Design an enzyme around this catalytic site. Structure first.
Site, PDB file in Angstrom:
ATOM      1  N   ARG A  43       0.854  -1.173   0.000  1.00  6.29           N
ATOM      2  CA  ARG A  43       0.000   0.000   0.000  1.00  6.29           C
ATOM      3  C   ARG A  43       0.893   1.228   0.000  1.00  6.29           C
ATOM      4  O   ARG A  43       1.924   1.265   0.686  1.00  6.29           O
ATOM      5  CB  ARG A  43      -0.863  -0.036   1.263  1.00  6.29           C
ATOM      6  CG  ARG A  43      -1.687   1.195   1.586  1.00  6.29           C
ATOM      7  CD  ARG A  43      -2.338   1.019   2.981  1.00  6.29           C
ATOM      8  NE  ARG A  43      -3.663   0.410   2.897  1.00  6.29           N
ATOM      9  CZ  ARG A  43      -4.205  -0.419   3.793  1.00  6.29           C
ATOM     10  NH1 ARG A  43      -3.521  -0.874   4.835  1.00  6.29           N
ATOM     11  NH2 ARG A  43      -5.466  -0.812   3.630  1.00  6.29           N
ATOM     12  N   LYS A  45       0.500   5.819  -0.339  1.00  3.74           N
ATOM     13  CA  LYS A  45      -0.408   6.887   0.056  1.00  3.74           C
ATOM     14  C   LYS A  45      -1.686   6.886  -0.772  1.00  3.74           C
ATOM     15  O   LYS A  45      -2.772   7.110  -0.228  1.00  3.74           O
ATOM     16  CB  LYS A  45       0.291   8.244  -0.060  1.00  3.74           C
ATOM     17  CG  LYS A  45       1.256   8.554   1.064  1.00  3.74           C
ATOM     18  CD  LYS A  45       0.804   9.790   1.858  1.00  3.74           C
ATOM     19  CE  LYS A  45       1.757  10.120   3.009  1.00  3.74           C
ATOM     20  NZ  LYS A  45       1.230  11.165   3.963  1.00  3.74           N
ATOM     21  N   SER A  47      -2.430   4.456  -3.399  1.00  2.00           N
ATOM     22  CA  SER A  47      -2.577   3.256  -4.216  1.00  2.00           C
ATOM     23  C   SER A  47      -2.365   2.025  -3.370  1.00  2.00           C
ATOM     24  O   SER A  47      -1.794   2.067  -2.279  1.00  2.00           O
ATOM     25  CB  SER A  47      -1.580   3.223  -5.384  1.00  2.00           C
ATOM     26  OG  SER A  47      -0.260   3.201  -4.889  1.00  2.00           O
ATOM     27  N   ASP A 152      11.431   9.629  -8.320  1.00  4.38           N
ATOM     28  CA  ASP A 152      11.367   8.727  -7.169  1.00  4.38           C
ATOM     29  C   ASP A 152      12.262   7.506  -7.374  1.00  4.38           C
ATOM     30  O   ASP A 152      11.888   6.382  -7.029  1.00  4.38           O
ATOM     31  CB  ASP A 152       9.924   8.322  -6.870  1.00  4.38           C
ATOM     32  CG  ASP A 152       9.692   7.801  -5.517  1.00  4.38           C
ATOM     33  OD1 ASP A 152      10.482   8.001  -4.576  1.00  4.38           O
ATOM     34  OD2 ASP A 152       8.633   7.089  -5.349  1.00  4.38           O
TER      35      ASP A 152
HETATM   36  O1  LIG Z   1       3.582   1.251  -9.069  1.00  4.43           O
HETATM   37  C1  LIG Z   1       4.044   0.625  -9.980  1.00  4.43           C
HETATM   38  O2  LIG Z   1       4.386   1.090 -11.122  1.00  4.43           O
HETATM   39  C2  LIG Z   1       4.300  -0.852  -9.804  1.00  4.43           C
HETATM   40  C3  LIG Z   1       4.514  -1.661 -10.917  1.00  4.43           C
HETATM   41  C4  LIG Z   1       4.748  -3.001 -10.799  1.00  4.43           C
HETATM   42  C5  LIG Z   1       4.943  -3.605  -9.549  1.00  4.43           C
HETATM   43  C6  LIG Z   1       4.729  -2.797  -8.415  1.00  4.43           C
HETATM   44  C7  LIG Z   1       4.436  -1.423  -8.537  1.00  4.43           C
HETATM   45  N1  LIG Z   1       4.898  -3.305  -7.140  1.00  4.43           N
HETATM   46  C8  LIG Z   1       5.165  -4.557  -6.951  1.00  4.43           C
HETATM   47  N2  LIG Z   1       5.381  -5.000  -5.667  1.00  4.43           N
HETATM   48  C9  LIG Z   1       5.194  -4.341  -4.456  1.00  4.43           C
HETATM   49  C10 LIG Z   1       5.917  -4.806  -3.366  1.00  4.43           C
HETATM   50  C11 LIG Z   1       5.737  -4.207  -2.134  1.00  4.43           C
HETATM   51  C12 LIG Z   1       4.851  -3.160  -1.979  1.00  4.43           C
HETATM   52  C13 LIG Z   1       4.145  -2.714  -3.079  1.00  4.43           C
HETATM   53 CL1  LIG Z   1       3.018  -1.400  -2.887  1.00  4.43          CL
HETATM   54  C14 LIG Z   1       4.298  -3.291  -4.313  1.00  4.43           C
HETATM   55  C15 LIG Z   1       5.326  -5.478  -8.030  1.00  4.43           C
HETATM   56  C16 LIG Z   1       5.569  -6.840  -7.827  1.00  4.43           C
HETATM   57  C17 LIG Z   1       5.707  -7.647  -8.902  1.00  4.43           C
HETATM   58  N3  LIG Z   1       5.628  -7.210 -10.195  1.00  4.43           N
HETATM   59  C18 LIG Z   1       5.392  -5.936 -10.415  1.00  4.43           C
HETATM   60  C19 LIG Z   1       5.233  -5.013  -9.365  1.00  4.43           C
END
Ligand SMILES: O=C(O)c1ccc2c(c1)nc(Nc1cccc(Cl)c1)c1ccncc12
Ligand SMILES: NCCc1ccc(Cl)c(Cl)c1
Length: 328
Positions: A43, A45, A47, A152
């Site tokens: 999670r 802020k 999304s 970021d």
């Molecule tokens: O925002 C994007 O562009 C974005 C795009 C792709 C991923 C993502 C966030 N976050 C991932 N993992 C993740 C791991 C921990 C916390 C959160 Cl919030 C997210 C993730 C995992 C596996 N494949 C693609 C992604």
């Protein structure tokens, strides 16, 4: 008229207005009901991110559900991702969907099996660091050429599958379009990756902010101090930087760009010599450090954003020659 990018400065000006005028962008919103959520990943802020399966084709994806109130920021992230389509090592946006009843929007991305280097798989070798830094640089040169600052860059946003040797730059939610002379919000990046420009409130920054953040990541990887500059707050963050780069050098940067320092810094900055990068070498990191690595790092972690290497100039540095040779 204080500062502008050394590269790609006019590149959005030279494109159709529709390219960068994200407030005018009308996404095509598909049906989120095609996606089955498997597992919550985290999670932020505005999304939350779930692992998911597209039920029509059995593909594993991630779904990033967006708090729907933030319409301009949604359009921004969507338009930036569409503009970056097919870019090297940029996370692939597969679709833009809405729940057909609530109309809550979500972004569907390719899945990457991210390695936790903090124990599970392998502690990085010299070559590994060069390789993954070079792959990250490709993504930044691509987005900068596309007229986009990420704003970021940090380890969590650089997803690496260390078994397949894949890297993706993720989380474009803070990214903006660069326009010459535009003043940008300095409340971007994670504290430890904030460039001096942000920390001193200098709003006429550019792509080179991302190059500071990638230098902080290089330092952390070659010296094994993560994060490399560990401030306790934004003021302490600049002090941590100045204890390495030096205070006289900070003052030269401020004078060049006519920057005022918040006077609370008077009580905390002290007087610091510029340190030799070799001072950070010891038995635990010596196998990751070379003269090349230090020369590159010294050209990234500079106060003066205009004097930092561009992504391309960094790619071209001798530190990456072993990677270039292997990619041949
Ligand atoms: O925002 C994007 O562009 C974005 C795009 C792709 C991923 C993502 C966030 N976050 C991932 N993992 C993740 C791991 C921990 C916390 C959160 Cl919030 C997210 C993730 C995992 C596996 N494949 C693609 C992604
Ligand atoms: N999540 C992986 C962050 C990371 C770790 C090591 C390197 Cl060399 C890079 Cl570019 C990025």
């Amino acid at each position: 008229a204080g500062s502008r990018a050394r590269v790609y400065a006019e590149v959005n000006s030279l494109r159709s207005r529709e390219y960068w005028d994200y407030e005018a962008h009308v996404p095509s919103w598909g049906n989120q009901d095609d996606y089955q959520l498997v597992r919550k990943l985290g999670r932020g802020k505005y999304s939350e991110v779930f692992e998911a399966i597209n039920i029509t084709n059995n593909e594993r994806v991630v779904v990033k559900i967006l708090k729907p109130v933030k319409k301009k920021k949604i359009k921004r992230e969507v338009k930036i991702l569409e503009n970056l389509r097919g870019g090297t090592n940029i996370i692939k946006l597969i679709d833009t969907v809405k729940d057909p009843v609530s109309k809550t929007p979500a972004l569907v991305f390719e899945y990457i099996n991210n390695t936790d280097f903090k124990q599970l798989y392998q502690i990085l070798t010299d070559f590994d660091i060069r390789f993954y830094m070079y792959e990250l640089l490709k993504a930044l040169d691509y987005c900068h050429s596309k007229g986009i600052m990420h704003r970021d860059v940090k380890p969590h946003n650089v997803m690496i599958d260390h078994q397949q040797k894949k890297l993706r730059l993720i989380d474009w939610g803070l990214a903006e379009f660069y326009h010459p002379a535009q003043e940008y919000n300095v409340r971007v990046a994670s504290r430890y990756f904030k460039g001096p420009e942000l920390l001193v409130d200098y709003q006429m920054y550019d792509y080179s902010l991302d190059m500071w953040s990638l230098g902080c990541m290089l330092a952390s990887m070659i010296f094994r101090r993560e994060p490399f500059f560990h401030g306790q707050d934004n003021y302490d963050q600049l002090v941590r930087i100045a204890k390495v780069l030096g205070t006289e050098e900070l003052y030269g940067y401020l004078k060049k760009y006519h920057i005022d320092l918040d006077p609370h810094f008077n009580d905390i900055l002290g007087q610091h010599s510029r340190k030799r990068w070799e001072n950070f070498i010891h038995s635990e990191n010596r196998h990751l450090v070379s003269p090349e690595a230090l020369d590159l790092l010294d050209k990234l972690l500079r106060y003066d954003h205009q004097q930092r290497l561009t992504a391309k100039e960094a790619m071209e540095h001798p530190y990456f020659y072993p990677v270039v040779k292997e990619q041949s």
